[PDB]
Swiss-Prot record:
Active site: D232, E503, Y615
BNR repeats: 242-253, 424-435, 479-490, 528-539
Residues that span the membrane, as ranges: none
Catalytic reaction list: Hydrolysis of alpha-(2->3)-, alpha-(2->6)-, alpha-(2->8)- glycosidic linkages of terminal sialic acid residues in oligosaccharides, glycoproteins, glycolipids, colominic acid and synthetic substrates
UniProt GO molecular function: exo-alpha-sialidase activity
Biological processes annotated in GO: ganglioside catabolic process; oligosaccharide catabolic process
Keyword match Cell membrane: no
Protein name: Sialidase B
InterPro entries named in the record: BNR_rpt, ConA-like_dom_sf, Glyco_hydro_33_N, Sialidase, Sialidase_fam, Sialidase_sf, Trans_sialidase_dom3
Coiled coil: none
Residues binding substrate, per UniProt: R207, R519, R581
Length: 658
């Protein structure tokens, strides 16, 4: 249907615009849709875009408003004092501000549906909230409404929540338009989604993006598909991948690179209220933090991720145990059987489960998918599904049987409750992945494993050498392979931090010269340099000119293929802020050939300083553009947990950055 009101090019310069005469007598019935295209690249701290209000003395709490905050949060209020109703619905990190230096046209669609008693908000083609109430309040049924306002709310004759921005288009409809109709509204998005709610992963949330450009020109991405809200393990998390064959313009339907099936892959709306938001899937095995590299020699793509057995995160990982037993320089995965107090079993060659107390082998074997077989027959466990139907999280059997895996809660044989690193490979550039294999311990029998640095591994240009950075307490532990990842050795590099989340990414400055940039606890990004392709490492220095928070954020980095201002260049991606994960930047550094020092010359503002930016992935696309896949929200903040579709991808050109 057509709009009851349509207007455009309104400039909101800290002065509201009265449209009461044009709009109020048009409103009819109890269901309404608002469609608004607006820019706000210099918003006030808290501002209303649109208001319907009773402006009379004594009715200051009788109004409907669409408001935003300078954090990028969008919301509505719907208030009527006589009815005793004060609704506020909102979601953080729903907005764009600027892209390539230009103000972004956000497309907002608000649906107020009296039939279903539901208020739904979409921004830029993303549903950010849908709220059903017992007692519905039509937005124009508020007692004594006498003003329709853009850029403020009129309360008792004064302008509240004054806005700075512009409304290029606004339309209103006396109908709650369907999800279908909403999907046909044209958008002006500066970004795209690779992974998203409702896709093949069926995860409602994603974190920890990666990007890597393959030699064929295919661009590959991996990511944590996170099911139990955005929480780090313990949770259910799979690793998913998607690729683009047209320089990032379109992306394949995701597949899994690493997956467990002890819990159903469920799209769940995780509670965001303070009482329940820390609910956590607590009995699922999980993966977390993936990293990708390509091997020139074999042509294989290699992907590593951390692996957790059921119930396990870094918080409760058996810190004193690698989970392997050493025998004659070889390492065997330990196993505990149902009923034993200790781990009296190991997995030997060909997956033979072996009893250690009596050195007898068993009739049990572990296959290649880490599944348990008895006498060659595959054992099963009943799968779990989760729900909040009771008003709190329940995890329960769902009637479905799945292969029994040693990482599962219900398994006859269980691995040690600690963190492992898994490896998988693809021989078709991400069209399918092999069953994963555990990497061996690198720091000994009684040391728990290191933590993978998410992002990229490094394929040295002038050799077959492959390197994946990992971290543990007191050091970076580089994993090095010269045989297409069939065997790995470690190279330890001390860092002056204990228990840091020292997420590190590498660039090859020139042949055999590696600079690693890493997250610290000091508020500055650190780096170290190797000049012998990763064998030995320099002391730690720090970058001036970029700020991080005390707890730090992952930093991504690449060596750009083309010279800039006649110099070799490196590009870093990180938030730039000592306050939160916001103020995303790409920082372009030029290498000084005299000494390999880096002059950080150009800073590109990804979006507003106050808008969220967290973990990130950067790659040079085959056409020399820059692809960026990043968490567009504050993934540390306890207020921005469990948001859908905030991991987003943009395309940039070098001239945009400089
Ligand atoms: O808190 S954030 O800095 O956003 C993410 C840190 N995640 C680190 C990490 C790595 C591996 C595991 Cl298993 C866990 Cl639980 C946490």
């Amino acid at each position: 249907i057509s709009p009851i009101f349509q207007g455009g090019s309104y400039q909101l310069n800290n002065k509201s615009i009265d449209i009461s005469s044009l709009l109020l007598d048009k409103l009819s019935g109890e269901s309404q849709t608002v469609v608004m295209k607006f820019k706000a690249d210099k918003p006030n701290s808290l501002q209303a875009l649109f208001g319907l209000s009773n402006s009379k003395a004594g009715f200051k709490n009788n109004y409907f408003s669409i408001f935003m905050r300078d954090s990028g949060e969008i919301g509505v209020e719907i208030r009527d004092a006589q009815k005793g109703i004060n609704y506020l619905f909102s979601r953080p990190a729903s907005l764009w501000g600027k892209h390539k230096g230009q103000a972004v046209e956000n497309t907002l669609v608000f649906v107020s549906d009296s039939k279903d008693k539901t208020y739904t908000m979409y921004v830029n083609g993303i549903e950010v909230f849908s709220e059903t109430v017992d007692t519905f309040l039509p937005i124009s049924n508020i007692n004594g409404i006498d003003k329709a306002t853009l850029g403020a709310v009129n309360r008792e004759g004064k302008e509240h929540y004054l806005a700075k921005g512009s409304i290029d288009e606004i339309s209103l409809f006396n109908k709650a338009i369907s999800d279908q109709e909403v999907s046909t509204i044209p958008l002006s998005n500066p970004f795209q989604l690779i992974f998203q709610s409702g896709d093949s992963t069926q995860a409602n949330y994603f974190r920890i993006p990666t990007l890597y450009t393959l030699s064929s020109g295919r661009v590959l991405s991996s990511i944590d598909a996170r099911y139990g809200g955005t929480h780090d393990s313990k949770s259910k998390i799979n690793i998913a991948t998607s690729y683009s064959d047209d320089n990032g313009k379109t992306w394949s339907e995701p597949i899994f690179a690493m997956k467990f099936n002890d819990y159903e892959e469920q799209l769940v709306y995780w509670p965001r209220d303070n009482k329940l938001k820390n609910s956590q899937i607590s009995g699922s095995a999980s993966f977390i933090d993936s990293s990708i590299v390509e091997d020139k020699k074999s042509g294989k793509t290699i992907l590593l991720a951390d692996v957790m057995p059921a119930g396990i995160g870094n918080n409760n990982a058996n810190k004193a145990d690698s989970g392997f037993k050493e025998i004659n320089g070889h390492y065997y995965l330990k196993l505990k059987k149902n009923g034993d107090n200790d781990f009296r079993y190991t997995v030997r060659e060909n997956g033979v489960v072996y009893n250690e107390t009596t050195n007898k082998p068993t009739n049990y074997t572990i296959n290649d998918k880490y599944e348990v077989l008895e006498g060659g027959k595959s054992l099963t466990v009943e799968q779990y599904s989760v729900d909040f139907d009771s008003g709190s999280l329940r995890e329960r059997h769902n009637g479905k049987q799945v292969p029994m895996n040693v990482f599962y809660k219900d398994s006859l044989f269980k691995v040690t409750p600690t963190n492992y690193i898994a490896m998988t490979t693809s021989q078709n550039r991400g069209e399918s992945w092999e069953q994963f294999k555990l990497l061996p311990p690198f720091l000994g029998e009684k040391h728990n494993g290191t933590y993978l640095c998410p992002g990229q591994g490094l394929a040295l240009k002038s050799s077959n050498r492959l390197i994946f950075a990992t971290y543990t307490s007191g050091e970076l532990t580089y994993l090095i392979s010269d045989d297409s990842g069939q065997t790995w050795k470690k190279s330890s590099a001390s860092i002056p931090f204990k228990n840091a989340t020292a997420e590190a990414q590498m660039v090859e400055l020139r042949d055999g010269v590696i600079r690693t940039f890493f997250r610290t606890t000091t508020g500055k990004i650190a780096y170290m340099t190797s000049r012998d392709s990763g064998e030995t490492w320099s002391k730690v220095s720090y970058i001036d000119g970029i700020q991080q928070t005390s707890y730090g954020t992952q930093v991504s980095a690449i060596k750009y293929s083309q010279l800039i201002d006649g110099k070799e260049a490196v590009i870093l991606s990180t938030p730039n802020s000592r306050s939160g994960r916001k103020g995303g930047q790409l920082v372009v550094g030029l290498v000084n050939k005299e000494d390999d020092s880096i002059d950080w010359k150009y800073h590109y503002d990804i979006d507003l300083p106050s808008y969220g930016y967290a973990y990130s992935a950067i790659t040079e696309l085959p056409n020399h553009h820059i692809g960026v896949l990043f968490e567009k929200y504050d993934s540390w903040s306890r207020n921005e947990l469990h948001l859908s579709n905030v991991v987003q991808y943009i395309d940039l050109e070098i001239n945009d950055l400089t």
